[PDB]
mmCIF file of N, CA and C in Angstrom:
data_model
loop_
_atom_site.group_PDB
_atom_site.id
_atom_site.type_symbol
_atom_site.label_atom_id
_atom_site.label_comp_id
_atom_site.label_asym_id
_atom_site.label_seq_id
_atom_site.Cartn_x
_atom_site.Cartn_y
_atom_site.Cartn_z
ATOM 1 N N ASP A 131 0.895 -1.165 -0.059
ATOM 2 C CA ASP A 131 0.138 -0.004 -0.004
ATOM 3 C C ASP A 131 0.844 1.294 0.090
ATOM 4 N N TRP A 132 1.244 1.451 1.210
ATOM 5 C CA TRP A 132 2.600 2.203 1.258
ATOM 6 C C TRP A 132 3.607 1.611 0.269
ATOM 7 N N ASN A 133 3.774 0.393 0.730
ATOM 8 C CA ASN A 133 4.801 -0.475 -0.425
ATOM 9 C C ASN A 133 4.502 -0.197 -1.878
ATOM 10 N N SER A 134 3.386 -0.250 -2.035
ATOM 11 C CA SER A 134 2.788 0.003 -3.397
ATOM 12 C C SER A 134 3.353 1.624 -3.905
ATOM 13 N N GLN A 135 3.183 2.597 -2.894
ATOM 14 C CA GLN A 135 3.580 3.867 -3.356
ATOM 15 C C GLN A 135 4.995 4.187 -3.583
ATOM 16 N N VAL A 136 5.783 3.453 -2.904
ATOM 17 C CA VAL A 136 7.259 3.564 -2.830
ATOM 18 C C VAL A 136 7.604 3.016 -4.241
ATOM 19 N N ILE A 137 7.001 1.794 -4.464
ATOM 20 C CA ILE A 137 7.146 1.096 -5.899
ATOM 21 C C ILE A 137 6.883 2.101 -6.912
ATOM 22 N N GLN A 138 5.632 2.643 -7.029
ATOM 23 C CA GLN A 138 5.389 3.635 -8.068
ATOM 24 C C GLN A 138 6.379 4.660 -8.142
ATOM 25 N N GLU A 139 6.725 5.394 -7.100
ATOM 26 C CA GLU A 139 7.570 6.139 -7.042
ATOM 27 C C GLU A 139 9.085 5.986 -7.500
ATOM 28 N N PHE A 140 9.446 4.842 -7.045
ATOM 29 C CA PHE A 140 10.969 4.416 -7.625
ATOM 30 C C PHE A 140 10.883 4.117 -9.178
ATOM 31 N N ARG A 141 9.796 3.660 -9.760
ATOM 32 C CA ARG A 141 9.514 3.431 -11.221
ATOM 33 C C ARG A 141 9.460 4.736 -11.992
ATOM 34 N N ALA A 142 8.811 5.634 -11.290
ATOM 35 C CA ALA A 142 8.757 6.980 -11.964
ATOM 36 C C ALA A 142 9.946 7.942 -12.022
ATOM 37 N N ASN A 143 10.697 7.577 -11.063
ATOM 38 C CA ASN A 143 11.973 8.380 -10.850
ATOM 39 C C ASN A 143 13.240 7.798 -11.115
ATOM 40 N N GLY A 144 13.383 6.962 -12.130
ATOM 41 C CA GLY A 144 14.666 6.365 -12.642
ATOM 42 C C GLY A 144 15.197 5.486 -11.279
ATOM 43 N N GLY A 145 14.529 4.815 -10.450
ATOM 44 C CA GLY A 145 14.999 3.957 -9.334
ATOM 45 C C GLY A 145 15.469 4.708 -8.180
ATOM 46 N N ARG A 146 14.586 5.729 -7.974
ATOM 47 C CA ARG A 146 15.038 6.644 -6.730
ATOM 48 C C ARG A 146 13.620 7.007 -5.861
ATOM 49 N N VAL A 147 13.777 7.143 -4.596
ATOM 50 C CA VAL A 147 12.628 7.432 -3.798
ATOM 51 C C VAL A 147 13.106 8.437 -2.805
ATOM 52 N N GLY A 148 12.125 9.442 -2.416
ATOM 53 C CA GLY A 148 12.233 10.470 -1.399
ATOM 54 C C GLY A 148 12.027 9.888 0.017
ATOM 55 N N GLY A 149 11.510 10.973 0.683
ATOM 56 C CA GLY A 149 11.150 10.628 2.132
ATOM 57 C C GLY A 149 12.465 9.874 2.878
ATOM 58 N N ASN A 150 12.329 9.171 3.465
ATOM 59 C CA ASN A 150 13.607 8.390 4.301
ATOM 60 C C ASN A 150 14.519 7.695 3.349
ATOM 61 N N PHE A 151 14.279 7.674 2.024
ATOM 62 C CA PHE A 151 15.163 7.102 1.372
ATOM 63 C C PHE A 151 15.742 8.024 0.260
ATOM 64 N N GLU A 152 15.384 9.288 0.540
ATOM 65 C CA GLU A 152 16.127 10.417 -0.365
ATOM 66 C C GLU A 152 17.614 10.363 -0.409
ATOM 67 N N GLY A 153 18.084 10.205 -1.660
ATOM 68 C CA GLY A 153 19.394 10.149 -2.170
ATOM 69 C C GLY A 153 20.183 8.742 -1.948
ATOM 70 N N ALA A 154 19.299 7.789 -1.548
ATOM 71 C CA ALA A 154 19.905 6.391 -1.142
ATOM 72 C C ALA A 154 19.737 5.538 -2.540
ATOM 73 N N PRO A 155 20.551 4.560 -2.692
ATOM 74 C CA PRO A 155 20.713 3.722 -3.872
ATOM 75 C C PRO A 155 19.527 2.775 -3.382
ATOM 76 N N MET A 156 18.570 2.560 -4.294
ATOM 77 C CA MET A 156 17.359 1.704 -3.953
ATOM 78 C C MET A 156 17.255 0.506 -4.911
ATOM 79 N N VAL A 157 16.882 -0.457 -4.270
ATOM 80 C CA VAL A 157 16.481 -1.679 -5.018
ATOM 81 C C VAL A 157 15.168 -2.246 -4.760
ATOM 82 N N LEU A 158 14.293 -2.660 -5.678
ATOM 83 C CA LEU A 158 13.102 -3.429 -5.513
ATOM 84 C C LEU A 158 13.410 -4.912 -5.724
ATOM 85 N N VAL A 159 13.285 -5.619 -4.584
ATOM 86 C CA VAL A 159 13.570 -7.005 -4.599
ATOM 87 C C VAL A 159 12.444 -7.732 -4.876
ATOM 88 N N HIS A 160 12.186 -8.606 -5.814
ATOM 89 C CA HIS A 160 11.055 -9.579 -6.042
ATOM 90 C C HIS A 160 11.517 -10.717 -5.451
ATOM 91 N N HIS A 161 10.672 -11.307 -4.422
ATOM 92 C CA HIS A 161 10.933 -12.485 -3.723
ATOM 93 C C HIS A 161 9.828 -13.349 -3.685
ATOM 94 N N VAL A 162 9.957 -14.602 -3.165
ATOM 95 C CA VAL A 162 8.487 -15.367 -2.992
ATOM 96 C C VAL A 162 8.528 -16.374 -1.671
ATOM 97 N N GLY A 163 7.399 -16.084 -1.124
ATOM 98 C CA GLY A 163 7.397 -16.564 0.408
ATOM 99 C C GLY A 163 7.795 -18.141 0.189
ATOM 100 N N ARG A 164 9.005 -18.551 1.203
ATOM 101 C CA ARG A 164 9.368 -19.670 1.365
ATOM 102 C C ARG A 164 8.318 -20.770 1.823
ATOM 103 N N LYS A 165 7.194 -20.177 2.392
ATOM 104 C CA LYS A 165 5.967 -20.917 2.980
ATOM 105 C C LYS A 165 4.867 -20.791 2.159
ATOM 106 N N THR A 166 4.713 -19.560 1.756
ATOM 107 C CA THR A 166 3.150 -19.358 0.948
ATOM 108 C C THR A 166 3.347 -19.450 -0.486
ATOM 109 N N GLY A 167 4.537 -19.252 -1.082
ATOM 110 C CA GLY A 167 4.676 -19.420 -2.478
ATOM 111 C C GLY A 167 4.363 -18.148 -3.112
ATOM 112 N N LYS A 168 3.967 -17.101 -2.329
ATOM 113 C CA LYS A 168 3.543 -15.763 -2.991
ATOM 114 C C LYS A 168 4.641 -14.809 -3.209
ATOM 115 N N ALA A 169 4.636 -14.276 -4.445
ATOM 116 C CA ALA A 169 5.361 -13.278 -4.999
ATOM 117 C C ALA A 169 5.153 -11.905 -4.187
ATOM 118 N N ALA A 170 6.338 -11.067 -3.965
ATOM 119 C CA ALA A 170 6.150 -9.918 -3.298
ATOM 120 C C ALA A 170 7.410 -9.155 -3.724
ATOM 121 N N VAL A 171 7.210 -7.917 -3.611
ATOM 122 C CA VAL A 171 8.152 -6.997 -4.245
ATOM 123 C C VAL A 171 8.430 -6.034 -2.769
ATOM 124 N N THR A 172 9.758 -5.795 -2.501
ATOM 125 C CA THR A 172 9.958 -5.091 -1.288
ATOM 126 C C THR A 172 11.087 -4.071 -1.715
ATOM 127 N N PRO A 173 10.773 -2.975 -1.513
ATOM 128 C CA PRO A 173 11.902 -1.841 -1.884
ATOM 129 C C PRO A 173 12.733 -1.660 -0.548
ATOM 130 N N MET A 174 14.219 -1.510 -0.935
ATOM 131 C CA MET A 174 15.018 -1.372 0.316
ATOM 132 C C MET A 174 16.193 -0.559 -0.258
ATOM 133 N N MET A 175 17.145 -0.138 0.798
ATOM 134 C CA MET A 175 18.530 0.452 0.195
ATOM 135 C C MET A 175 19.230 -0.710 -0.041
ATOM 136 N N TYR A 176 20.224 -0.284 -0.823
ATOM 137 C CA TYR A 176 21.398 -1.188 -1.146
ATOM 138 C C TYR A 176 22.691 -0.606 -0.866
ATOM 139 N N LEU A 177 23.907 -1.154 -0.816
ATOM 140 C CA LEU A 177 25.075 -0.631 -0.870
ATOM 141 C C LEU A 177 25.820 -1.283 -2.130
ATOM 142 N N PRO A 178 26.350 -0.506 -3.103
ATOM 143 C CA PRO A 178 27.018 -1.219 -3.997
ATOM 144 C C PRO A 178 28.419 -1.786 -3.693
ATOM 145 N N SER A 179 28.803 -2.883 -4.426
ATOM 146 C CA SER A 179 30.053 -3.713 -3.966
ATOM 147 C C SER A 179 31.152 -2.670 -4.389
ATOM 148 N N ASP A 180 32.217 -2.574 -3.610
ATOM 149 C CA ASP A 180 33.274 -1.777 -3.954
ATOM 150 C C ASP A 180 34.279 -2.549 -4.779
ATOM 151 N N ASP A 181 34.094 -3.957 -4.935
ATOM 152 C CA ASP A 181 35.233 -4.854 -5.691
ATOM 153 C C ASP A 181 34.576 -5.505 -6.869
ATOM 154 N N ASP A 182 33.366 -5.376 -6.980
ATOM 155 C CA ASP A 182 32.719 -6.188 -8.117
ATOM 156 C C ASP A 182 31.579 -5.536 -8.717
ATOM 157 N N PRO A 183 31.607 -5.146 -9.951
ATOM 158 C CA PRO A 183 30.605 -4.386 -10.579
ATOM 159 C C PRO A 183 29.500 -5.481 -10.723
ATOM 160 N N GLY A 184 28.234 -5.089 -10.679
ATOM 161 C CA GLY A 184 27.120 -6.106 -10.868
ATOM 162 C C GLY A 184 26.703 -6.779 -9.461
ATOM 163 N N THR A 185 27.559 -6.580 -8.599
ATOM 164 C CA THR A 185 27.152 -7.172 -7.102
ATOM 165 C C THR A 185 26.507 -6.022 -6.386
ATOM 166 N N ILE A 186 25.473 -6.186 -5.466
ATOM 167 C CA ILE A 186 24.973 -4.966 -4.401
ATOM 168 C C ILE A 186 24.721 -5.904 -3.269
ATOM 169 N N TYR A 187 24.830 -5.386 -2.095
ATOM 170 C CA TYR A 187 24.614 -5.859 -0.817
ATOM 171 C C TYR A 187 23.334 -5.276 -0.380
ATOM 172 N N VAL A 188 22.415 -6.149 0.187
ATOM 173 C CA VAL A 188 21.235 -5.513 1.081
ATOM 174 C C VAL A 188 21.308 -6.109 2.374
ATOM 175 N N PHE A 189 20.414 -5.334 3.215
ATOM 176 C CA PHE A 189 20.838 -5.494 4.817
ATOM 177 C C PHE A 189 19.462 -6.059 5.342
ATOM 178 N N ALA A 190 19.335 -7.131 5.826
ATOM 179 C CA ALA A 190 18.125 -7.507 6.469
ATOM 180 C C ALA A 190 17.872 -6.920 7.823
ATOM 181 N N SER A 191 17.843 -5.708 7.807
ATOM 182 C CA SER A 191 17.884 -4.748 9.143
ATOM 183 C C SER A 191 16.378 -4.665 9.790
ATOM 184 N N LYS A 192 15.412 -4.748 9.170
ATOM 185 C CA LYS A 192 13.962 -4.540 9.622
ATOM 186 C C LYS A 192 13.822 -3.574 10.703
ATOM 187 N N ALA A 193 14.533 -2.426 10.692
ATOM 188 C CA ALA A 193 14.715 -1.327 11.510
ATOM 189 C C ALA A 193 15.025 -1.787 12.860
ATOM 190 N N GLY A 194 15.948 -2.852 13.084
ATOM 191 C CA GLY A 194 16.481 -3.247 14.323
ATOM 192 C C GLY A 194 15.579 -3.997 15.138
ATOM 193 N N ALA A 195 14.508 -4.569 14.544
ATOM 194 C CA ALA A 195 13.435 -5.345 15.194
ATOM 195 C C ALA A 195 14.103 -6.708 15.534
ATOM 196 N N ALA A 196 13.479 -7.358 16.640
ATOM 197 C CA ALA A 196 14.014 -8.700 17.042
ATOM 198 C C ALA A 196 14.208 -9.709 16.391
ATOM 199 N N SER A 197 13.475 -9.819 14.971
ATOM 200 C CA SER A 197 13.371 -10.864 14.124
ATOM 201 C C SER A 197 14.029 -10.486 12.716
ATOM 202 N N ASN A 198 14.497 -11.276 11.942
ATOM 203 C CA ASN A 198 14.826 -11.274 10.488
ATOM 204 C C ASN A 198 13.671 -10.982 9.815
ATOM 205 N N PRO A 199 13.709 -9.924 8.592
ATOM 206 C CA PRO A 199 12.555 -10.080 7.905
ATOM 207 C C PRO A 199 12.184 -11.173 6.947
ATOM 208 N N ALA A 200 10.824 -11.475 6.493
ATOM 209 C CA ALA A 200 10.542 -12.500 5.956
ATOM 210 C C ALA A 200 11.464 -12.619 4.461
ATOM 211 N N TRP A 201 11.669 -11.454 3.837
ATOM 212 C CA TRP A 201 12.217 -11.540 2.469
ATOM 213 C C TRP A 201 13.709 -12.152 2.676
ATOM 214 N N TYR A 202 14.398 -11.932 3.778
ATOM 215 C CA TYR A 202 15.680 -12.582 4.097
ATOM 216 C C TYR A 202 15.529 -14.167 3.802
ATOM 217 N N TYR A 203 14.575 -14.891 4.564
ATOM 218 C CA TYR A 203 14.454 -16.258 4.409
ATOM 219 C C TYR A 203 14.042 -16.663 3.040
ATOM 220 N N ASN A 204 13.222 -15.718 2.410
ATOM 221 C CA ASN A 204 12.719 -15.968 1.136
ATOM 222 C C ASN A 204 13.890 -16.026 0.056
ATOM 223 N N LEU A 205 14.784 -14.964 0.060
ATOM 224 C CA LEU A 205 15.953 -15.093 -0.812
ATOM 225 C C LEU A 205 16.929 -16.207 -0.643
ATOM 226 N N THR A 206 17.336 -16.468 0.674
ATOM 227 C CA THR A 206 18.384 -17.386 0.851
ATOM 228 C C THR A 206 17.645 -18.841 0.464
ATOM 229 N N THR A 207 16.377 -18.983 0.685
ATOM 230 C CA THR A 207 15.824 -20.110 0.354
ATOM 231 C C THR A 207 15.904 -20.456 -1.098
ATOM 232 N N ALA A 208 15.294 -19.432 -1.987
ATOM 233 C CA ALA A 208 15.215 -19.544 -3.376
ATOM 234 C C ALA A 208 16.751 -19.566 -4.091
ATOM 235 N N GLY A 209 17.726 -18.910 -3.356
ATOM 236 C CA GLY A 209 19.116 -18.688 -3.837
ATOM 237 C C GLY A 209 19.210 -17.856 -5.183
ATOM 238 N N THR A 210 18.119 -17.325 -5.640
ATOM 239 C CA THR A 210 17.948 -16.542 -6.982
ATOM 240 C C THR A 210 16.780 -15.602 -6.739
ATOM 241 N N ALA A 211 16.782 -14.653 -7.379
ATOM 242 C CA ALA A 211 15.689 -13.471 -7.475
ATOM 243 C C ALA A 211 15.679 -12.578 -8.581
ATOM 244 N N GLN A 212 14.954 -11.666 -8.819
ATOM 245 C CA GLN A 212 14.902 -10.689 -9.645
ATOM 246 C C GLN A 212 14.731 -9.396 -8.965
ATOM 247 N N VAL A 213 15.513 -8.241 -9.497
ATOM 248 C CA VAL A 213 15.468 -7.019 -8.745
ATOM 249 C C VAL A 213 15.387 -6.011 -9.812
ATOM 250 N N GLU A 214 14.921 -4.628 -9.532
ATOM 251 C CA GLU A 214 14.991 -3.477 -10.110
ATOM 252 C C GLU A 214 15.979 -2.694 -9.563
ATOM 253 N N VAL A 215 17.051 -2.401 -10.375
ATOM 254 C CA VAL A 215 17.829 -1.204 -9.790
ATOM 255 C C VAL A 215 18.122 -0.206 -10.898
ATOM 256 N N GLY A 216 17.854 1.050 -10.685
ATOM 257 C CA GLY A 216 18.240 2.134 -11.657
ATOM 258 C C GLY A 216 17.000 1.983 -12.637
ATOM 259 N N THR A 217 17.237 1.990 -13.765
ATOM 260 C CA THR A 217 16.040 1.835 -14.925
ATOM 261 C C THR A 217 16.072 0.195 -15.163
ATOM 262 N N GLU A 218 16.800 -0.586 -14.718
ATOM 263 C CA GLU A 218 17.111 -1.889 -15.213
ATOM 264 C C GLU A 218 16.036 -2.912 -14.282
ATOM 265 N N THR A 219 16.109 -4.111 -14.856
ATOM 266 C CA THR A 219 15.425 -5.430 -14.181
ATOM 267 C C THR A 219 16.192 -6.570 -14.558
ATOM 268 N N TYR A 220 16.889 -7.136 -13.634
ATOM 269 C CA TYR A 220 17.578 -8.374 -14.057
ATOM 270 C C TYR A 220 17.457 -9.625 -13.000
ATOM 271 N N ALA A 221 18.018 -10.640 -13.347
ATOM 272 C CA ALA A 221 18.088 -11.726 -12.452
ATOM 273 C C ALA A 221 19.279 -11.636 -11.477
ATOM 274 N N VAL A 222 19.306 -12.278 -10.277
ATOM 275 C CA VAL A 222 20.301 -12.186 -9.430
ATOM 276 C C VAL A 222 20.528 -13.597 -8.655
ATOM 277 N N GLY A 223 21.911 -13.892 -8.430
ATOM 278 C CA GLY A 223 22.354 -15.121 -7.581
ATOM 279 C C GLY A 223 22.309 -14.491 -6.164
ATOM 280 N N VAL A 224 21.847 -15.183 -5.167
ATOM 281 C CA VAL A 224 21.815 -14.872 -3.789
ATOM 282 C C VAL A 224 23.055 -15.535 -2.825
ATOM 283 N N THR A 225 23.889 -14.847 -2.284
ATOM 284 C CA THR A 225 24.798 -15.509 -1.263
ATOM 285 C C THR A 225 24.761 -14.690 0.057
ATOM 286 N N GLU A 226 24.853 -15.253 1.179
ATOM 287 C CA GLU A 226 24.975 -14.424 2.462
ATOM 288 C C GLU A 226 26.323 -14.221 2.771
ATOM 289 N N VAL A 227 26.636 -12.907 3.209
ATOM 290 C CA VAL A 227 27.994 -12.445 3.682
ATOM 291 C C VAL A 227 27.883 -12.739 5.165
ATOM 292 N N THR A 228 29.339 -13.383 5.582
ATOM 293 C CA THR A 228 29.496 -13.758 7.091
ATOM 294 C C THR A 228 31.003 -13.179 7.409
ATOM 295 N N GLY A 229 30.977 -13.330 8.839
ATOM 296 C CA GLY A 229 32.292 -13.167 9.370
ATOM 297 C C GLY A 229 32.837 -11.689 9.319
ATOM 298 N N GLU A 230 34.000 -11.459 9.159
ATOM 299 C CA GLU A 230 34.785 -10.066 9.263
ATOM 300 C C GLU A 230 34.192 -9.367 7.802
ATOM 301 N N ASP A 231 34.191 -10.144 6.655
ATOM 302 C CA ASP A 231 33.442 -9.392 5.683
ATOM 303 C C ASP A 231 32.179 -8.858 5.844
ATOM 304 N N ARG A 232 31.035 -9.485 6.336
ATOM 305 C CA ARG A 232 29.958 -8.892 6.776
ATOM 306 C C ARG A 232 30.001 -7.533 7.461
ATOM 307 N N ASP A 233 31.043 -7.784 8.504
ATOM 308 C CA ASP A 233 31.231 -6.621 9.478
ATOM 309 C C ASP A 233 31.616 -5.294 8.569
ATOM 310 N N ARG A 234 32.601 -5.612 7.682
ATOM 311 C CA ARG A 234 33.169 -4.470 6.833
ATOM 312 C C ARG A 234 32.064 -3.932 5.999
ATOM 313 N N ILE A 235 31.412 -4.787 5.231
ATOM 314 C CA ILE A 235 30.276 -4.198 4.363
ATOM 315 C C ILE A 235 29.230 -3.445 5.437
ATOM 316 N N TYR A 236 28.766 -4.040 6.623
ATOM 317 C CA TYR A 236 27.978 -3.502 7.418
ATOM 318 C C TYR A 236 28.508 -2.107 7.834
ATOM 319 N N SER A 237 29.818 -2.199 8.176
ATOM 320 C CA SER A 237 30.389 -0.654 8.669
ATOM 321 C C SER A 237 30.427 0.250 7.844
ATOM 322 N N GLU A 238 30.538 -0.075 6.336
ATOM 323 C CA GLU A 238 30.538 0.986 5.512
ATOM 324 C C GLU A 238 29.188 1.532 5.177
ATOM 325 N N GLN A 239 28.076 0.627 5.321
ATOM 326 C CA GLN A 239 26.692 1.208 5.254
ATOM 327 C C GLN A 239 26.373 2.020 6.486
ATOM 328 N N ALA A 240 26.885 1.708 7.522
ATOM 329 C CA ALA A 240 26.504 2.326 8.900
ATOM 330 C C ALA A 240 27.208 3.686 8.869
ATOM 331 N N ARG A 241 28.450 3.817 8.178
ATOM 332 C CA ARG A 241 29.314 4.999 7.981
ATOM 333 C C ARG A 241 28.370 5.935 7.106
ATOM 334 N N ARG A 242 27.637 5.492 6.031
ATOM 335 C CA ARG A 242 26.795 6.451 5.155
ATOM 336 C C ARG A 242 25.626 6.804 5.961
ATOM 337 N N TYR A 243 25.124 5.828 6.566
ATOM 338 C CA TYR A 243 23.673 5.987 7.237
ATOM 339 C C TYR A 243 23.773 5.435 8.746
ATOM 340 N N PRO A 244 24.180 6.286 9.638
ATOM 341 C CA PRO A 244 24.465 5.936 10.965
ATOM 342 C C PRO A 244 23.120 5.349 11.642
ATOM 343 N N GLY A 245 22.110 5.467 11.221
ATOM 344 C CA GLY A 245 20.790 4.787 11.760
ATOM 345 C C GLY A 245 21.154 3.157 11.542
ATOM 346 N N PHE A 246 21.814 2.664 10.710
ATOM 347 C CA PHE A 246 22.363 1.233 10.702
ATOM 348 C C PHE A 246 23.047 0.829 11.980
ATOM 349 N N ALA A 247 23.852 1.696 12.526
ATOM 350 C CA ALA A 247 24.514 1.465 13.856
ATOM 351 C C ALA A 247 23.600 1.373 14.851
ATOM 352 N N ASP A 248 22.481 2.102 14.787
ATOM 353 C CA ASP A 248 21.444 2.007 15.936
ATOM 354 C C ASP A 248 20.914 0.667 15.846
ATOM 355 N N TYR A 249 20.679 0.269 14.501
ATOM 356 C CA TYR A 249 19.769 -1.139 14.316
ATOM 357 C C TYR A 249 20.747 -2.174 15.147
ATOM 358 N N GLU A 250 21.933 -2.320 14.914
ATOM 359 C CA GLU A 250 22.815 -3.176 15.478
ATOM 360 C C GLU A 250 23.052 -3.088 16.789
ATOM 361 N N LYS A 251 22.843 -1.990 17.638
ATOM 362 C CA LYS A 251 22.800 -1.818 18.899
ATOM 363 C C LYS A 251 21.495 -2.134 19.511
ATOM 364 N N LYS A 252 20.226 -2.014 18.894
ATOM 365 C CA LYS A 252 19.078 -2.628 19.213
ATOM 366 C C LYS A 252 19.030 -4.231 19.092
ATOM 367 N N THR A 253 19.668 -4.815 18.229
ATOM 368 C CA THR A 253 19.738 -6.038 17.919
ATOM 369 C C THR A 253 20.973 -6.877 18.862
ATOM 370 N N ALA A 254 21.810 -6.196 19.594
ATOM 371 C CA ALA A 254 22.911 -6.815 20.258
ATOM 372 C C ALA A 254 22.409 -7.869 21.167
ATOM 373 N N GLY A 255 22.909 -9.111 21.049
ATOM 374 C CA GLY A 255 22.580 -10.128 21.857
ATOM 375 C C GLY A 255 21.264 -10.914 21.431
ATOM 376 N N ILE A 256 20.855 -10.363 20.454
ATOM 377 C CA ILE A 256 19.513 -11.174 19.831
ATOM 378 C C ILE A 256 19.670 -11.509 18.626
ATOM 379 N N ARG A 257 19.983 -10.755 17.611
ATOM 380 C CA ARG A 257 20.501 -11.390 16.310
ATOM 381 C C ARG A 257 21.560 -10.564 15.723
ATOM 382 N N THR A 258 22.406 -11.168 14.820
ATOM 383 C CA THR A 258 23.288 -10.474 14.181
ATOM 384 C C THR A 258 22.504 -10.117 12.507
ATOM 385 N N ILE A 259 22.390 -8.892 12.187
ATOM 386 C CA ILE A 259 21.693 -8.361 11.007
ATOM 387 C C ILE A 259 22.410 -9.011 9.788
ATOM 388 N N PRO A 260 21.491 -9.830 8.998
ATOM 389 C CA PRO A 260 22.292 -10.431 7.924
ATOM 390 C C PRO A 260 22.519 -9.485 6.553
ATOM 391 N N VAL A 261 23.666 -9.823 6.007
ATOM 392 C CA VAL A 261 23.930 -9.179 4.778
ATOM 393 C C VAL A 261 23.814 -9.894 3.755
ATOM 394 N N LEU A 262 23.204 -9.700 2.665
ATOM 395 C CA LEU A 262 23.168 -10.732 1.434
ATOM 396 C C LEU A 262 23.691 -9.913 0.316
ATOM 397 N N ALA A 263 24.527 -10.766 -0.604
ATOM 398 C CA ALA A 263 24.891 -10.276 -1.732
ATOM 399 C C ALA A 263 24.078 -10.681 -3.009
ATOM 400 N N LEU A 264 23.631 -9.719 -3.587
ATOM 401 C CA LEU A 264 22.720 -10.192 -4.941
ATOM 402 C C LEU A 264 23.807 -9.747 -6.098
ATOM 403 N N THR A 265 23.929 -10.851 -6.823
ATOM 404 C CA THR A 265 24.946 -10.774 -7.911
ATOM 405 C C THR A 265 24.258 -11.004 -9.254
ATOM 406 N N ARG A 266 24.462 -9.842 -10.200
ATOM 407 C CA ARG A 266 23.659 -10.001 -11.277
ATOM 408 C C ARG A 266 24.157 -11.359 -12.250
ATOM 409 N N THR A 267 23.189 -12.010 -12.877
ATOM 410 C CA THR A 267 23.283 -12.939 -13.765
ATOM 411 C C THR A 267 22.522 -12.631 -14.963
#
C-alpha cells in the first residue's frame, strides 16, 4: 500500500525514492514466500560492491527489530531473485556474507547511514543483521 506507493515512486523516478530513502541507492527485490509461495516486491536500500561490478549488498535490518524480515528467508531459500535497480530489471544469484566480511560491508553502510549502527545496537545479543550479496546474472 505504502509499499505500493514507494514502488510507483521508484519506477517514476529512475529508481529513486524520497522521504527516508532520499538520495539512497534503492532496489526493488522480487521474492517469493518460502512457505506461501506468493510473490512480493520489497523496496530497500542497497550498498554497491566496492570490488565487483554487478554485485549489490542488502541488509536484513528490519529497523533493528527482534526478528529477521521474511524477505531474508525467502531469498536465501530460493538462492536467486529478480531485482529492479536504476532503470534496469535483472536476475540475481543470492549468497549470504558472514564473518569479518559482513562486518566490513555493514560498517560502510553504517558509516553512510548511521541509523544502521543504531539497528545493530538494538539487536545486540538477539540477532546479527544479515547481509546478502545480490549478484547480477
